[PDB]
Subunit: 180 residues, 8 copies
């Protein structure tokens, strides 16, 4: 399956992020060589989660996304059993040691408005914080609490718009947008 | 001596921490292949001491634990002979340059209450600060002065509860708990 | 699933071999955390294939085992389309540039006699060379042509018997033997 | 073309900075082996841009200089399309996430006065911030807003005067000064 | 210029080979982003030259291809001025210290027959040895002297056919073949 | 010249510090194999200078000690020609970009009182700041301005007393003390 | 215990060899800080064993010396159980895959004559090969079969005489010689 | 002393060879910044000695050149005291374990004829082998025994002629030739 999207994903994202998105997709019964648009989505969501944890302090964030299903749930139990936050129903992306809450990071191709509502209806735990990023440069967080400073968030938006530009340069953006 | 506990310890802790706990046990006439529960304890105590010094400033802590007996006592003399703190009777774990005191780090499987009293009766030097961590997520420090920020301490509790979970997953926690 | 076998496999084989055996099992719908005996078999077979290619000359062997299914078949086509050997029905392990033939490497827990016959009935291509190794130290190759020198083969047998010893030391050999 | 200036440039600046200045010159139809004085200028301007971004915070600056023409313009579009700053007519050197503006870094051999006016007449976008450095130790920024702290700027002036000293020691400064 | 061929070239060949082919093309006034088929050809020819020198002894071959124009001609002069071979009119790829002759390596998409004749008419120096490789697996050398052993040459043919397969998988082979 | 002191110096200080002290001594016509006590002094003074610059900010200090005579004077000229401080008569150890002054670091075996007076009479430039450290743990700076925080200075005193302890353990301290 | 011999051993032998000799001595109830002459002997014997295995082919030798007691005996069992050689009574140093025999390497300070007889009376297994080296440059092997080529053995003798020279330069050779 | 020759030497030879030639010159009371032609000679002679030892077998040559005066004489004593060759009056460059003799490597700018006679009159030990290389490509060894194979020697001549070309390109060859 010689897909242009797959070759672009492998040259756009670092090898370690590509390997993690490939392990995550294969675990859930998805083929990155065939589900090439979703392949680009898992990498993008992974990178955003990594830059997000790169903002703030060194011991500030515990990274849940990127681990295997069993170990990610193991760290979630340890965080709940030492701090006291309720165990979320769905796997979140990070945990904020500064604010004592889980973070669900979203990357959308539509307006940040519908996606957050979609993620807020899924997350029954009202404690879990939600932060949505768009490929257009718009963002949206729970209670207008954007956690990070403006410049760590600005770096993420700039990166998201560069991925869009490179996709549109290869005529792959249109399929990517009409795929979410 | 093919012990499950030993194989789990070697895959749970980093090689450098394993090598240090092995050198420390052999020096005191203990075999890590036979004293496998204590082997897990020396590694756990070592890691906690390392994360503890990772909190705070770069030049903040002097690490006493993890060295050989003679060199650890050499650094203790140098700290006493330049700052003026009294020479402790027993080897401590760290020295706080910010607060000018030695720190005795404890990791217990019972309630933090009995362990601290056990360590407070041993440490005749009332100057030495005591900080106890539990596998349940509870902590306890001298004069309620927990030295580090809440999040550096939270990371240690989360790690301690993950070690417990992995031990219980392998049916090794019960023997570990009824061993201290 | 806290399995002693899994923890022993991760400490017995190098991380890169473990990662390859995990990718290979997951691709064929197998869980290394549950199929722990087979997990030890894929690692052992992988290592033997790597030591086998380490024998002989630098450009002598092309390693087919250890790649993903599609790329392994891609290299097989390239070898057939430049040398002229017939395309094998099943994926082999190596290709010998010195002798111009594919090699099927076997690692068995029974007598090398039954396993080779089992592999000779499967391999319809009589051109493909077969080389069987046992955990007891016995070996068996097609037409008594053992390809490598005696000492490269001796190193593989010694390694296979060390894996057996470590397994029996942990009381895991009996389950491993009655599992093939 | 055995030029003393070229050999001094290769031993004065790090290899990565030399490689970038060589790629930048060749793209614009310039030969570093013949345009040896300009070769020293591109390296010097590159280093100053790198030390400038080394000042301040980790996520503070986005480095535009040093990339190829197409990618540098790609990051500029992403910054404009997520923050809202106007697209500059000419390629700048950095973007300040803290102050939300592009920075044009200048390194001159004359008085900082004429060079800034020369760069202020070229930059039609009044939003773009201008910061000029001289080989004599003088500096000059837009609205007297020097962005960085005094010591990050002091390190750049010291480096610029060391390059001058090494050039004059090799009797290459006079040609370099009468070349801008 | 979002070209599928360019993204495939960057993921097919190692970064160091890609960087060398990019420097070589830009020097001769060629854009790898636009001349994407030739971009794949320079990388392929470079790799073949590197594997070719990897065959034989350690001090056997002097690599001429891959250097800048001036330095490649400098090494050619040094080889002629110490051994005595005539200075070739055109830049060759290697020099054989074992056989005391220059080697011109060719990689063609047509039959090895026409390409060698094309290269034999260009190379006036009858001393220079010619070795042609095809993407089909055929090879052809001067005086039937193929220099290397069969297996070093076999590895090159296998690699050439894998590049073809990956190109055809992405529907890029047809344009590549009808481009030489 | 098999000196115990030389073998202890090579095992006490890191190789890079040893190499710098050896280059510095040989430049001034001193043999580290014969002047073994001074060899220990140059290493100790070098390390203290390096830990001192490790305190404070990243761009805070410019390290003058440890360079060759000509380059150290080159950086001194650049600092004077961009900030405006007077050119010191003797080579200092550091420059403070935060406080805009040169620092002369001293390590003595007698009382800090006589050494500073000895260094204050030599340094005609009253602008240059003086900071003296002793092997007993006492320190002494110009105008009681100790530049660094207490804990960066405490780390230096602890290290100095450990060097003393290791020297006295090998019966080399007495010769070292009666040598300054 | 500030011993000159210990400081010389740490600067004469590489850190990895020093760490192995320290682990070996501590396991057998010996202190390298007190048994400093034997400390030099374990390092010397270890290095000679490593250079010896460095001679010959890559897969030629299996290194038994340098492992912990249990694992060294594990590899010995695997070699006996795959080749068929009798299990030696005492732990040897190497195994020769080329000649199918164990090797006992000796390093002596007396004449090679008495030491070999001392080692030949201990080794009941007449199959085990014995190879003795002296600090004077003399060697002595079983059946005059010196296994390695003359130059690999010559390198070992040269190294042994350099260790002697450095010891005598520090006036430590006399104690070392009158210690075996 | 801004010398073109010094800047060319630092960019022509690797940093490790430059550092060794600088240590060797300073030991004998020579300044590489002033004796720039000799600086180029020590580097060239060092490199040739290193390529020469790179030819042949791995354990074949013992490198005497490049060490400090005392250690080089220490290895010479060890070689004489284990093999039996007479102690040379002057420090040689290598020792051949294959042929059991010392090698004096020469690099000359005149005809190899006069230089060898100059070196043969100095070397009283007729046992020491002499091998002379010229910048023109001519070589000359004792008893026509050139030790290495033709291609290892050819690589050295090619390198020597490239150094000449780069020197003449910078107009530094004429001074270098009229300096020996
Ligand atoms: C810890 C390790 C991997 C971490 C993932 C994360 C990646 C991090 C790398 C940093 C350095 N940067 C930044 C510059 C380039 C680079 O490389 N960033 C952040 C930006 C993009 C990126 O790549 N981090 C953070 C700690 C060190 C590290 O690597 N992960 C993976 C999921 C869980 C986790 O914590 N782990 C943990 C066990 C398995 C594994 O692999
Ligand atoms: C200094 C050195 C070892 C230090 C121990 C300690 C280990 C540290 C490593 C850091 C980096 N991290 C963090 C991410 C992974 C990693 O690797 N952490 C902290 C967390 C777990 C861990 O591993 N530190 C601190 C300084 C550098 C270093 O390594 N020790 C050992 C005892 C005394 C001491 O200071 N020393 C000193 C001489 C002997 C030796 O070995
Ligand atoms: C090429 C690379 C991986 C190779 C696998 C193989 C592993 C090799 C590593 C060697 C070095 N040794 C030996 C000492 C320790 C070590 O590390 N050995 C051999 C013994 C055990 C081991 O580990 N080799 C050989 C070339 C370099 C390399 O690593 N593989 C994986 C499957 C296909 C293949 O060729 N590739 C290729 C693309 C993906 C990838 O990962
Ligand atoms: C990111 C990477 C290169 C960066 C350029 C820049 C160089 C940086 C290196 C640092 C570390 N230091 C400081 C001490 C020595 C050293 O090495 N400094 C700053 C001082 C001089 C220097 O060298 N940085 C910053 C991030 C890491 C890095 O290397 N560049 C090049 C242009 C765009 C860019 O961001 N990239 C990005 C893709 C291509 C590439 O190469
Ligand atoms: C010397 C250096 C680069 C060499 C090019 C060549 C690359 C070589 C790398 C080897 C190792 N392998 C093999 C496994 C992966 C790897 O990495 N191979 C051969 C196979 C593909 C490949 O990559 N070699 C050979 C010597 C070391 C080296 O790297 N070149 C570039 C042109 C001239 C030259 O000699 N040089 C010289 C100065 C500039 C530069 O870059
Ligand atoms: C810059 C470089 C060398 C620097 C000297 C200094 C050494 C520094 C190393 C750090 C990292 N740590 C700390 C942990 C272990 C280690 O390694 N520390 C500080 C503590 C002891 C030590 O070793 N620093 C600072 C910048 C990076 C570096 O290495 N020097 C030498 C004199 C001038 C100078 O700036 N240079 C510059 C050109 C020549 C050279 O060598
Ligand atoms: C394998 C590994 C260690 C090996 C010991 C041995 C050391 C070897 C290192 C080589 C490379 N050279 C040579 C130049 C400098 C250097 O570094 N040489 C030989 C000369 C001196 C030296 O140091 N070898 C050989 C394989 C790679 C390696 O390192 N050992 C230790 C005992 C058992 C064993 O096989 N192992 C195995 C598991 C534990 C461990 O540590
Ligand atoms: C051993 C070490 C240094 C050696 C000098 C010599 C350098 C060698 C490096 C090789 C690898 N190549 C080749 C490709 C690039 C590279 O790097 N080559 C040979 C060609 C040019 C070069 O550089 N060798 C040989 C063994 C490993 C090593 O490095 N020397 C210095 C004098 C004495 C000696 O044996 N030593 C020993 C103690 C001090 C020290 O530094
Ligand atoms: C079941 O879904 C899949 C999840 C994964 C790994 C990511 N794990 C998440 O939990 C997750 N997934 C998504 C998401 C999605 F919900 C739909 C489409 C694309 C996405 F990236 N957005 C998030 O923010 C987030 O945290 C791999 C394969 C899967 O099929
Ligand atoms: C003598 O005891 C031993 C100590 C060590 C190394 C640790 N050195 C300590 O000083 C230390 N030991 C312990 C501790 C304990 F007291 C009992 C059981 C397990 C422990 F980890 N807790 C600490 O907090 C602490 O600082 C190795 C082997 C020993 O037998
Ligand atoms: C479908 O089988 C599986 C194969 C693999 C990867 C190995 N690929 C092989 O082709 C292969 N497999 C086996 C083998 C086997 F046939 C049965 C049990 C265990 C084995 F290791 N022996 C070989 O020699 C060999 O080359 C992963 C998971 C699979 O389920
Ligand atoms: C077209 O000009 C060239 C630019 C470059 C790369 C640098 N890209 C810039 O945009 C740039 N150039 C300059 C500059 C200049 F304007 C004149 C002379 C020397 C200079 F360094 N100063 C800056 O501050 C700056 O940002 C390479 C080759 C070129 O010919
Ligand atoms: C001429 O003196 C020598 C200096 C050096 C390099 C150190 N360069 C200094 O300038 C310096 N020297 C000293 C010092 C001293 F003055 C006497 C004895 C020992 C010392 F370390 N203390 C400092 O604080 C300081 O900065 C190498 C060899 C020399 O003979
Ligand atoms: C029990 O002896 C000890 C052995 C070791 C590790 C070495 N293991 C050996 O088996 C060995 N020991 C010796 C040897 C000796 F026999 C006496 C004195 C010094 C020696 F190096 N020579 C060999 O050749 C050899 O192979 C560590 C501490 C020990 O006390
Ligand atoms: C005393 O001479 C010096 C030697 C050295 C280090 C090299 N050690 C040698 O022994 C040596 N020197 C020379 C040589 C020479 F004899 C004259 C001029 C240039 C040379 F490279 N050619 C050799 O082949 C050789 O082995 C450094 C500085 C010295 O002044
Ligand atoms: Mn998620
Ligand atoms: Mn998410
Ligand atoms: Mn402790
Ligand atoms: Mn403790
Ligand atoms: Mn297979
Ligand atoms: Mn197989
Ligand atoms: Mn610019
Ligand atoms: Mn600029
Ligand atoms: Mn060609
Ligand atoms: Mn100084
Ligand atoms: Mn000083
Ligand atoms: Mn032995
Ligand atoms: Mn010499
Ligand atoms: Mn010589």
């Amino acid at each position: 399956r010689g897909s242009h999207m797959e070759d672009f994903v492998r040259q756009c994202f670092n090898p370690m992020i590509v390997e993690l998105a490939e392990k995550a997709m294969k675990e859930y019964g998805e083929d990155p060589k065939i589900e090439t648009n979703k392949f680009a989505a898992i990498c993008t969501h992974l990178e955003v989660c990594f830059m997000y944890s790169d903002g703030g302090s060194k011991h500030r964030f515990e990274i849940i996304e990127g681990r295997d299903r069993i170990m990610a749930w193991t760290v979630v139990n340890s965080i709940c059993n030492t701090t006291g936050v309720e165990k979320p129903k769905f796997l979140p992306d990070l945990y904020d040691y500064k604010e004592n809450r889980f973070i669900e990071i979203g990357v959308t191709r539509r307006e940040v408005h519908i996606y957050y509502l979609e993620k807020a209806n899924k997350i029954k735990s009202e404690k879990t914080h939600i932060h949505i990023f768009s490929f257009t440069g718009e963002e949206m967080a729970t209670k207008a609490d954007y956690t990070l400073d403006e410049e760590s968030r600005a770096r993420i938006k700039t990166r998201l718009f560069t991925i869009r530009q490179e996709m549109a340069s290869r005529s792959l953006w249109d399929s990517f947008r009409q795929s979410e």
